[PDB]
Amino acid sequence: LMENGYTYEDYKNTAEWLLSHTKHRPQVAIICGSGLGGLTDKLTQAQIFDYSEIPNFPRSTVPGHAGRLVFGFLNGRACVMMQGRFHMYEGYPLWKVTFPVRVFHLLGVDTLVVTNAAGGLNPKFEVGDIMLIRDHINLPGFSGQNPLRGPNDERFGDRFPAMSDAYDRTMRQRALSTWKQMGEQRELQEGTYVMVAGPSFETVAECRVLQKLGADAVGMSTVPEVIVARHCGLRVFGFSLITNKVIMDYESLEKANHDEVAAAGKQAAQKLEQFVSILMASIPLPD
Amino acid sequence: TLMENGYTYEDYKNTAEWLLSHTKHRPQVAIICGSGLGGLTDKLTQAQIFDYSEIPNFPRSTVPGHAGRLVFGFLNGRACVMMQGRFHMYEGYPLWKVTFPVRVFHLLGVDTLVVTNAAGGLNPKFEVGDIMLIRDHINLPGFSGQNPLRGPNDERFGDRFPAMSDAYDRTMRQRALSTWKQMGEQRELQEGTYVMVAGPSFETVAECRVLQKLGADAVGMSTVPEVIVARHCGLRVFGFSLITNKVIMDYESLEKANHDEVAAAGKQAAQKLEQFVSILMASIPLPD
Amino acid sequence: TLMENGYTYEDYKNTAEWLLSHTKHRPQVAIICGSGLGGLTDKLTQAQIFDYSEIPNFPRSTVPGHAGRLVFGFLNGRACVMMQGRFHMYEGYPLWKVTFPVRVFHLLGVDTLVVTNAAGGLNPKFEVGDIMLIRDHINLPGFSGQNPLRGPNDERFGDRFPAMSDAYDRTMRQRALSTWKQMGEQRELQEGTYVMVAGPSFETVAECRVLQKLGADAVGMSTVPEVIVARHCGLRVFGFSLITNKVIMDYESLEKANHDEVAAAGKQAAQKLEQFVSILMASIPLPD
Ligand SMILES: Nc1nc2c(CN3C[C@H](CO)[C@@H](O)C3)c[nH]c2c(=O)[nH]1
Ligand SMILES: Nc1nc2c(CN3C[C@H](CO)[C@@H](O)C3)c[nH]c2c(=O)[nH]1
Ligand SMILES: Nc1nc2c(CN3C[C@H](CO)[C@@H](O)C3)c[nH]c2c(=O)[nH]1
């Protein structure tokens, strides 16, 4: 069987270890993507764990991803923040990539906020823009790479969970209204995020495929975390920072490259911090 | 470091010889029964039942509404073997396990495979309860590497590079379409393209729109691997889907795909499916 | 459980040193010959042949029409190494084995990779026997995780996240087309997008239609992984396909894709292929 290497008991031990070693009790988990680790600077009463301390955690390998779990309060809300994440392209199976999401469920988290860098496929997008994720296209999932493959553990969720309501309608409505409170020249964009495995960037022909399929942005993460979160009942909210426009003609001499991506994160850090801090107020209270 | 079939020729043959030893039945036609369609075995005569767990080298069905039994008998006087329950790659099985029984059926003497499944309707003219004849398929996992024929080719089964443009028998499709009049149902017999996705999660709205843009009429998580292995070894293949739900294609809808609704639409379409298959048996050729 | 390249840097280095000691040839250009295109080695002078089986760490070719030899020599006065036969993921090889020679060629001092293949024509204006210059590719297995660069990156070869938008060298492409015009050719040179599918089974009609809708002009089961590895380590890349057959795009045809027709095409195209390879070799810049 191509199954989950972790048992329920493995997820439980990691959860109990974290509950022993901190007094924090997060309601919200935030996964910070490529060059968005500055979202953990505004946390009050921060307690930090390195991923290598925490039993059963995977290592973080990619530049701009620190490898640190941080508990704290963000604008009043009890939060846990993954400073850096795991990617299929680093060689991890998807049951390792998504291991933290289930641990968070067992801590008592009820809301997952997922952030990423993404390449812009919709031509109306501009570098620096923030796109709310209305929906995704899980290209690896079509082929068999789904983190729920293998035996289903009823203790987390259903054998066959729906994803047609994955991205919380209500939190999206509130973040569109709230957008007035940043007075930005640019509007809050909304669209479909497509996951591709990477780690190489898209050809022009691939870019046009993705546009034709109806995607507005592209990246190499996030979707598996969303599936596992919806499987175990988490409210999910997501956004992408558009870090580059994907090359869509043969004439251009520009090329996607990681430095440009990291650089668009340094520029946007102020705007995101403020966006996320306001978002926290729009999250429903528990129970 | 080689990604190959974990069964040897000898494993298939051993399983086939075990089966031939423990039954007097000698099936000509194999029928694979999908989700909610296990009632297709109800009208077999002189039935003999094996549990999958008794049969050497056989995998286990882990999905609700797949009984996990191999049933030999007579359907409208034709010698059949029926898989009451099937396997899926979402369960953890490699495609070489999922398709194990198709090659066993070849070694037993079977020459025609009937595949059935439940499917989500993507074509808006389909209603819940419709039967779709599978004209063709789109093998999305196959594009990316997940093909049951990956690895060394065994010439005892078939060619290294089998064609699939003729996978679903053109003559039985003519005969089944013209035969439909024999049941005097309100809906006509639907026809279309089946697309496989791995699952086990259901589609997002954006994914539903992808599959519609690609030209699929219905979506499921099975069948295609079985059909590829069947064509590779020379089997004639006929397929159909029961449309159990319309896949959600807009953000406003309250409706959600779920297994209980799928299984219930299965049992509602019970009588009707048994009857269609029974009459279909009369259109399958004998050897010689 | 970590899904990584099974070769160390020192495996590649050992294979490269072994080749450097066993031949005096010092190639600048590597050419990978695909199905039925092994005849491109005939015009090499001062040829020195190695069977893949005698070279350390080399995989084996298992497909008919792939001789399994590495040939060093001069092709039109330019120092080349030719793979007479390549490896495919459908044989069961992981993509890090499929692409193993590309990095060996880098360490031998090669600076240009030419990739050739047979392909099925999707664009209806292509005829059997056409040569299509590859302007671009669509890596369908790559979308799903089947990428030869997956796992830890070795900085000794290249970057973690390499760009592919400029993979097929534009200048070589321009020169090849100018030259073909300057010759005053009747049948103009085709240019288009190659899509990789895993195989080994050929496409259904519905699958052919999907690949047309995605913007692909030609379909095969190779090439793309080699190009990705080539670009990762700084090689200049040029590809072309021989269109060996037209992909079946309607249900009324009785034709079927088959391997025999693919070999018949290669022998038939031999003079055309030689002429094109000459044009192409004279388009490759010299080192400084
Ligand atoms: N596929 C893809 N991903 C990204 C990303 C997202 N990640 C950023 C990082 C490479 O800079 C990888 O983890 C992918 C930003 N831009 C792009 C792009 O153009 N394409
Ligand atoms: N992908 C998909 N498959 C199905 C199926 C077919 N199978 C039914 C079962 C889930 O109920 C799985 O084995 C998939 C029915 N409806 C749908 C759908 O809407 N989508
Ligand atoms: N996928 C695909 N590949 C090819 C090829 C390329 N290879 C030729 C060989 C089978 O003839 C495999 O390695 C694939 C030629 N024609 C076709 C086709 O119609 N389809």
Q: Is the dihedral of CA B72, B78, B79, B84 positive or negative?
A: negative
Name which of B286, B284, B265 is nearest B35 in CA terms.
Answer: B265
Is the CB of B146 inside 8 Å of chain C's CB atoms? yes
Q: How far is the CA of B34 from the centre of ligand 2 (A)?
A: 10
The crossing angle, in degrees rounded to 10, of helices C9-22 and C100-108 is 60
Show me where the domains of chain B are located. Answer: 1-288
Place of tokens 């050992």: C14
Scored b (16 or more CB within 10 A) or e, B154-178 reads beebbbbbbbbbbbbbeebbebbee
Contact B217, B123 (CB under 8 A): yes
Q: Closest-lying ligand to the alpha carbon of A207? A: 1
Say how many Å lie between the CA of residue A105 and the centre of ligand 1: 27
Query: What distance in Å separates the CA atoms of residue C13 and residue C187, rounded to the nearest whole number?
Result: 44
Strand B131-139 vs strand A111-120: parallel, antiparallel, or unpaired? unpaired
Q: Which residues contact A164 (CB under 8 A, 6 or more apart)?
A: B202, B203, B204, B205, B208, B248, B253, B256, B257
Indicate which residue's Cα is closest to atom 10 of ligand 2.
B259
The best mutation among C86, C202, C204 to test binding of ligand 3, ranked by most ligand atoms within 8 Å of the C-beta, falls on C202
- Nearest-angstrom CA–CA distance, B190 and B147: 28
HSE, side-chain direction, 13 A CA sphere, residue B114: 28
The nearest CA of chain C is from the CA of B230 a distance in Å of: 12
What's the full length of chain A, in residues?
287
B66 is in an annotated binding site: yes
Judging by DSSP bridges, how do beta strands B69-75 and A235-245 pair with one another? Answer: unpaired
Distance in angstroms (rounded) separating the CA atoms of residues A15 and A100: 9
B-chain residues within 8 Å CB-CB of A163? 201-204, 207
Contact C228, B233 (CB under 8 A): no
Q: Residue C257: closest CA among chain B residues belongs to which residue?
A: B163
Q: Is C216 a catalytic residue?
A: no
Domain B1-288 has CATH 3.30.200.20: no
For C59, the 3-state DSSP assignment is: coil
Q: Residue A44 pairs with which residues in a beta bridge? A: A73
Residue in A86, A219, A225 with CA at minimum distance from that of residue A166: A225
Mutating to test ligand 1, I would choose from A243, A261, A266 the residue with most ligand atoms within 8 A of its C-beta, which is A261
**Token pair listed for C104:** 């060996």
Residue B98 near residue B148, CB atoms below 8 Å: yes
Total Cβ atoms within 10 A of residue A45:
10
CATH 3.40.50.1580 fits A1-287, yes or no: yes
Q: Does A262 touch chain C (CB under 8 A)?
A: no
Report the distance separating Cα C35 and Cα C90, nearest Å.
Answer: 14
Joined together, the tokens standing for residue B234 give: 């020379």
Q: What stretches of A93-195 adopt beta strand conformation (E)?
A: 111-120, 130-138, 189-195
Catalytic (active-site) positions of A: 34, 65, 87, 89-90, 117, 220-221, 244, 258
Task: Find chains touching chain B: ≥3 CB pairs under 8 Å.
Answer: A, C
* Separation CA C64–CA B186 (nearest Å): 53
Q: How far is the CA of A95 from the centre of ligand 2 (A)?
A: 22
Phi, psi of C233 (to 5 degrees): -95, 20
Pairing of strands A28-32, A77-83: parallel
Mind telling me how many Å the CA of A163 is from chain B's nearest CA?
5
Token pair listed for A145: 């790479």
End-to-end alpha-carbon separation of chain C, Å? 44
Host H or E run for residue C272:
helix C270-282
User: Residue B232 and residue A199: Cα distance in Å, rounded?
Assistant: 35
Angle at B135 between CA B129 and CA B138, to 5 degrees: 95
**In sequence order, what are the residues at sequence separation of 6 or more whose Cβ sits closer than 8 angstroms to the Cβ of residue B206?**
A135, A136, A137, A192, A214, A215
C100, containing H or E segment: helix C100-108
Q: Which helix (H) or strand (E) holds A140?
A: helix A139-143
Task: Tell which atom from ligand 1 comes closest to the C-alpha of A256.
Answer: 19
Q: Based on the residue annotation, tell me whether B118 is a catalytic residue of this protein.
A: yes
What's the CA-to-centroid distance between B279 and ligand 2, angstroms?
26
Q: What contacts 24+ positions apart, CB below 8 Å, involve B44-47? A: B44/B71, B44/B73, B44/B74, B44/B75, B44/B80, B44/B82, B45/B73, B45/B74, B45/B75, B46/B73, B46/B74, B47/B71, B47/B72, B47/B73
Rounded CA-CA distance C89/C98 in Å is: 7
Tokens representing A24? 């924090």
Alpha helical stretches, state H, C151-258? 170-182, 205-213, 224-232
Residues counted in chain B: 288
Q: Give the pair of three-digit tokens for residue A273.
A: 């911090």
Q: In this structure, what token pair is assigned to residue C35?
A: 């199905």
Instruction: For chain A, positions 110-129, list CB contacts with chain B under 8 A.
Output: none
Instruction: Extract the tokens encoding A17.
Output: 């270890």
SS3 for chain B, per residue? CCCCCCCCHHHHHHHHHHHHHHCCCCCCEEEEECCCCHHHHCCCEEEEEEEHHHCCCCCCCCCCCCCCEEEEEEECCEEEEEEECCCCHHHCCCHHHHCHHHHHHHHHCCCEEEEEEEEEECCCCCCCCCEEEEEEEEEHHHHHCCCCCCCCCCCCCCCCCCCCCCCCCHHHHHHHHHHHHHHCCCCCCEEEEEEECCCCCCCCHHHHHHHHHCCCCEEECCCHHHHHHHHHCCCEEEEEEEEEEECCCCCCCCCCCCHHHHHHHHHHCHHHHHHHHHHHHCCCCCCC
B119 min Cα distance to partner chain C (Å): 17
B260 exposed, middle or buried (CB, 10 Å; 0-12, 13-18, 19+)?
exposed
Cβ(B36)–Cβ(B242) below 8 Å: yes
C-alpha span between B95 and B89 (Å, rounded): 6
- Spatial distance between the Cα atoms of C31 and A40, rounded to a whole number of angstroms: 51
Return the exposure string of A100-130: e unless at least 16 CB atoms fall within 10 Å of the residue's CB, then b. bbbbbbbbebbbbbbbbbbbbbbeebebebb
B170: contact with C, CB 8 A cutoff: yes
